[PDB]
Paper text:
The Neisseriaceae family of Gram-negative bacteria express a bipartite receptor, HpuAB, to efficiently use haem extracted from Hb:Hp complexes as an iron source. [name] is expressed outside the cell, anchored to the outer membrane by its acylated amino terminus. Although a direct interaction between [name] on meningococci and Hb was not detected using flow cytometry, the lipoprotein is required for the high-affinity interaction between HpuB and Hb, for meningococcal survival on Hb as a sole iron source and for efficient dissociation of Hb2023. To investigate the structure and function of [name] we crystallized the carboxy-terminal portion of the protein from [name] (NgHpuA-C) and a full-length homologue from K. denitrificans (KdHpuA).
Author numbering: 194 to 217, 235 to 292, 302 to 341
The structure:
Amino acid sequence: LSKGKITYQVWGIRVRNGQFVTSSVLSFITANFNSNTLAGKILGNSDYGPDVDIQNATITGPTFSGDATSGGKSGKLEGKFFEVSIGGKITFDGDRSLDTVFGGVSYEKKLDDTSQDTNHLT
Protein backbone atom coordinates (compact mmCIF):
# COMPACT_ATOMS: atom_id res chain seq x y z
CA LEU A 1 0.00 0.00 0.00
CA SER A 2 2.97 2.28 -0.80
CA LYS A 3 1.51 4.42 -3.63
CA GLY A 4 -1.48 4.82 -5.96
CA LYS A 5 -5.24 4.97 -5.41
CA ILE A 6 -7.79 2.27 -4.57
CA THR A 7 -11.55 2.88 -4.65
CA TYR A 8 -13.46 0.39 -2.56
CA GLN A 9 -17.07 -0.61 -2.72
CA VAL A 10 -18.38 -0.77 0.89
CA TRP A 11 -21.37 -1.76 3.05
CA GLY A 12 -22.09 -0.75 6.63
CA ILE A 13 -24.02 -2.61 9.30
CA ARG A 14 -26.13 -1.06 12.06
CA VAL A 15 -28.43 -2.59 14.66
CA ARG A 16 -32.12 -1.71 14.35
CA ASN A 17 -34.98 -3.37 16.19
CA GLY A 18 -32.66 -6.12 17.51
CA GLN A 19 -31.40 -7.13 14.04
CA PHE A 20 -28.43 -6.23 11.89
CA VAL A 21 -29.27 -4.13 8.86
CA THR A 22 -26.99 -3.25 5.97
CA SER A 23 -26.51 0.02 4.10
CA SER A 24 -27.39 0.87 0.41
CA VAL A 25 -25.79 2.97 -6.81
CA LEU A 26 -22.93 2.13 -4.48
CA SER A 27 -21.04 3.36 -1.47
CA PHE A 28 -17.40 4.17 -2.31
CA ILE A 29 -14.42 4.86 -0.13
CA THR A 30 -11.21 5.96 -1.89
CA ALA A 31 -7.73 5.66 -0.35
CA ASN A 32 -4.94 7.76 -1.78
CA PHE A 33 -1.68 6.01 -0.74
CA ASN A 34 0.45 8.83 -2.21
CA SER A 35 -1.01 11.66 -0.08
CA ASN A 36 -2.17 9.34 2.78
CA THR A 37 -5.76 10.68 2.54
CA LEU A 38 -9.13 8.93 2.36
CA ALA A 39 -12.74 9.90 1.73
CA GLY A 40 -16.14 8.57 0.88
CA LYS A 41 -19.72 8.06 1.85
CA ILE A 42 -21.80 5.11 3.04
CA LEU A 43 -25.25 5.48 1.54
CA GLY A 44 -28.11 4.40 3.87
CA ASN A 45 -31.76 3.37 3.37
CA SER A 46 -34.85 3.45 5.61
CA ASP A 47 -33.56 0.65 7.89
CA TYR A 48 -29.86 1.53 8.08
CA GLY A 49 -30.82 5.19 8.49
CA PRO A 50 -28.63 8.21 7.73
CA ASP A 51 -25.75 8.22 5.21
CA VAL A 52 -22.22 8.35 6.62
CA ASP A 53 -19.95 11.01 5.17
CA ILE A 54 -16.15 10.77 5.44
CA GLN A 55 -14.18 13.86 4.42
CA ASN A 56 -10.40 14.21 4.80
CA ALA A 57 -9.54 11.06 6.71
CA THR A 58 -5.90 9.97 7.18
CA ILE A 59 -3.87 6.86 6.27
CA THR A 60 -0.83 5.45 8.06
CA GLY A 61 0.48 2.19 6.65
CA PRO A 62 -2.34 -0.41 6.63
CA THR A 63 -4.55 1.68 8.99
CA PHE A 64 -6.80 4.69 8.55
CA SER A 65 -8.81 7.01 10.75
CA GLY A 66 -10.59 10.33 10.93
CA ASP A 67 -13.91 12.04 11.45
CA ALA A 68 -17.25 11.18 9.94
CA THR A 69 -20.67 12.72 10.06
CA SER A 70 -24.05 11.01 10.06
CA GLY A 71 -27.52 12.41 10.75
CA GLY A 72 -26.00 15.65 12.10
CA LYS A 73 -23.67 13.82 14.51
CA SER A 74 -19.91 13.53 14.32
CA GLY A 75 -18.20 10.18 14.53
CA LYS A 76 -14.72 8.81 14.89
CA LEU A 77 -13.52 6.47 12.13
CA GLU A 78 -10.96 3.72 12.61
CA GLY A 79 -10.15 1.02 10.09
CA LYS A 80 -7.72 -1.25 8.35
CA PHE A 81 -6.68 -2.35 4.89
CA PHE A 82 -6.36 -6.11 4.28
CA GLU A 83 -9.42 -7.82 -5.25
CA VAL A 84 -8.35 -6.42 -1.86
CA SER A 85 -10.45 -5.37 1.09
CA ILE A 86 -11.11 -2.69 3.73
CA GLY A 87 -12.97 -2.62 7.04
CA GLY A 88 -13.58 -0.32 9.94
CA LYS A 89 -15.84 1.08 12.58
CA ILE A 90 -17.43 4.40 13.25
CA THR A 91 -18.50 5.52 16.70
CA PHE A 92 -20.83 8.46 17.41
CA ASP A 93 -20.62 9.51 21.06
CA GLY A 94 -23.60 11.87 20.69
CA ASP A 95 -25.84 9.07 19.38
CA ARG A 96 -24.48 5.52 19.62
CA SER A 97 -27.37 4.07 17.56
CA LEU A 98 -25.45 5.55 14.59
CA ASP A 99 -22.42 3.38 15.33
CA THR A 100 -21.56 1.14 12.36
CA VAL A 101 -19.00 -1.48 11.29
CA PHE A 102 -18.28 -1.60 7.58
CA GLY A 103 -16.36 -3.69 5.06
CA GLY A 104 -15.73 -3.61 1.33
CA VAL A 105 -13.67 -4.89 -1.58
CA SER A 106 -11.73 -2.97 -4.23
CA TYR A 107 -13.97 -1.52 -7.00
CA GLU A 108 -11.03 -0.10 -8.96
CA LYS A 109 -7.24 -0.08 -8.37
CA LYS A 110 -4.81 2.43 -9.89
CA LEU A 111 -1.55 1.50 -8.14
CA ASP A 112 0.47 3.77 -10.50
CA ASP A 113 -1.94 6.69 -10.03
CA THR A 114 0.15 9.74 -9.04
CA SER A 115 -2.73 12.09 -8.12
CA GLN A 116 -3.09 13.47 -4.56
CA ASP A 117 -6.92 13.56 -4.42
CA THR A 118 -9.53 11.08 -3.10
CA ASN A 119 -11.94 11.37 -6.06
CA HIS A 120 -13.37 7.94 -6.83
CA LEU A 121 -12.03 5.77 -9.62
CA THR A 122 -14.67 4.62 -12.17
